[PDB]
């Protein structure tokens, strides 16, 4: 009503007063405080023309920069803090994979002296936290996780795994079904069959978890506020 | 510390400002001042230890450089760096690459003045997943990814430290040396074409950084913003 109009005007006035006080405070400060900006961060971007091609049913955490020509298929996930930077050469990851948070993928030597190096990740590959992948070809259903790093034209194959510190270097053809470790990499076991089923079940249930995180992380402000008030009132 | 007194009273005043603004908003009937959104200022100060990046030096908007950190031209701070300069400053020269997933850290306060600085002198590549805590790396340096440089280490003048390797306290890698493994032991010598390649990679990443920044300055794409406000 008219009362509403009046108090709206009054609220606008005192809000202006607040802005003025804030500027006065920054100017009493000054030179030091880097006042806040908007996000200005890209979850997806191109480089020269290559736009990313991302499946619809994927999860991409809004703290994961995909840049270049990244072709990411179905039922996969690019978790938090991730960096899929293929600005120089092609990146294609299989369908049903998962890059568990805070990992990186880069490629270097596009079409120099004839020899080229793409980078491909097979289906149902579960690369873990802090995994560095620098120009590699990981065939489908292979396990790499917890801080591993692959240096060069390495190719892992068909259920092989490198675990927890594997620094694999300079064009290693990983045998079809093993485990490696070591700094540098050597094998020490035989990768039992129930463990193969472990990596498969890992890919599957991790796709499930990624779908949950997507449904959560892709909400708007009003829906989030509703969810929060409902959670509080219910826990009451 | 009169500056710090001014800073504190500035906080009081600006805080009263925020509070009176919020009272105004509640009166106006608009609770938009709750849309939780990460601050993450890519460049941050503490009291007067603000960073200083030279113009034309690409810093990815997802980086995090805070504390007394100073960096010169032709440099690149690629997505996912933590450049801390709280206790002892970081200085980084020209034509340098600090790649994505790297921190140039400074040891949390040890008792004495044992908090060494960190100097990264121009024409240096510091690849992905690189932790440099309190070190002195010099011109024409290669720190190939998976790297750890613990406090007290000095690498210089066309020197390479391979990959996935850590260098303990008080170790020096002078010209023409590669060290690797846990701990970092000497392997072999270098090659002149490899040194020229160091320089060429430095230049190539300088150009890459120019491109990435010129793309990051592309007007924010209002269409997606109005989309996300629609639904």
């Amino acid at each position: 009503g008219t009362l509403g109009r009046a108090i709206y005007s009054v609220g606008f006035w005192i809000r202006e007063t607040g802005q003025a006080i804030d500027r006065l405070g920054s100017r009493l400060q000054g030179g030091y405080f880097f006042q806040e900006q908007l996000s200005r961060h890209r979850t997806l971007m191109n480089i020269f023309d290559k736009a990313p091609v991302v499946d619809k049913d994927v999860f991409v955490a809004p703290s994961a920069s995909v840049i270049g020509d990244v072709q990411v298929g179905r039922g996969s996930s690019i978790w938090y803090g991730c960096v899929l930077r293929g600005d120089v050469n092609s990146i294609r990851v299989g369908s049903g994979t998962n890059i568990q948070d805070n990992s990186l993928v880069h490629v270097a030597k596009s079409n120099l002296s004839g020899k080229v190096l793409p980078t491909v990740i097979g289906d149902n590959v579960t690369v873990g936290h802090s995994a560095v992948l620098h120009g590699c070809t990981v065939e489908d259903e292979a396990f790499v996780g917890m801080g591993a790093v692959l240096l060069d034209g390495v190719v892992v194959e068909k259920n092989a795994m490198v675990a927890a510190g594997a620094l694999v270097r300079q064009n290693t053809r990983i045998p079809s079904g093993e485990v490696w470790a070591g700094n540098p990499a050597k094998f020490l076991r035989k990768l039992s069959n129930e463990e193969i089923t472990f990596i498969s079940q890992s890919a599957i249930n991790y796709t499930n978890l990624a779908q949950v995180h997507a449904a959560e992380n892709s909400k708007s402000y009003d829906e989030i506020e509703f969810e929060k008030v409902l959670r509080k009132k219910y826990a009451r | 510390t009169l500056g710090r007194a001014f800073y504190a009273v500035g906080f009081w005043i600006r805080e009263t400002g925020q509070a009176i603004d919020r009272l105004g908003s509640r009166l106006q009937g608009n609770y938009l001042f709750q849309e939780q959104l990460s601050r993450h200022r890519p460049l941050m100060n503490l009291f007067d230890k603000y960073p200083s990046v030279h113009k034309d030096a690409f810093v990815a908007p997802s980086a995090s450089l805070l504390g007394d950190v100073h960096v010169g031209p032709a440099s690149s701070i690629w997505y996912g760096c933590v450049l801390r300069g709280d206790v002892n400053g970081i200085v980084i020269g020209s034509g340098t690459n600090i790649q994505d997933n790297s921190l140039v850290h400074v040891a949390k306060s040890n008792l004495t003045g044992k908090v060494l600085p960190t100097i990264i002198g121009d024409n240096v590549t510091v690849g992905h997943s690189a932790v440099l805590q309190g070190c002195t790396v010099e011109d024409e340096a290669f720190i190939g990814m998976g790297a750890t440089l613990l406090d007290g280490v000095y690498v210089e003048k066309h020197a390479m430290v391979a990959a996935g390797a850590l260098v303990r306290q008080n170790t020096r890698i002078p010209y023409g040396e590669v060290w690797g493994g846990n701990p970092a032991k000497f392997l072999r010598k270098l090659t002149e074409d490899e040194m020229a390649f160091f320089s060429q990679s430095a230049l190539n990443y300088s150009n890459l950084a120019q491109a990435h920044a010129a793309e990051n300055a592309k007007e924010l794409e209002e269409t997606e913003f109005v989309k996300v406000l629609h639904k």
Partner: peptide, 30 residues
Amino acid sequence: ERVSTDKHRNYAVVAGTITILGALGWYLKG
């Protein structure tokens, strides 16, 4: 789009500003 559309809050705000004005007047009559 130039008004507040919550009746209860507006009544409460009227009461609050009346309260502060009354206290100021009371003090003025100390």
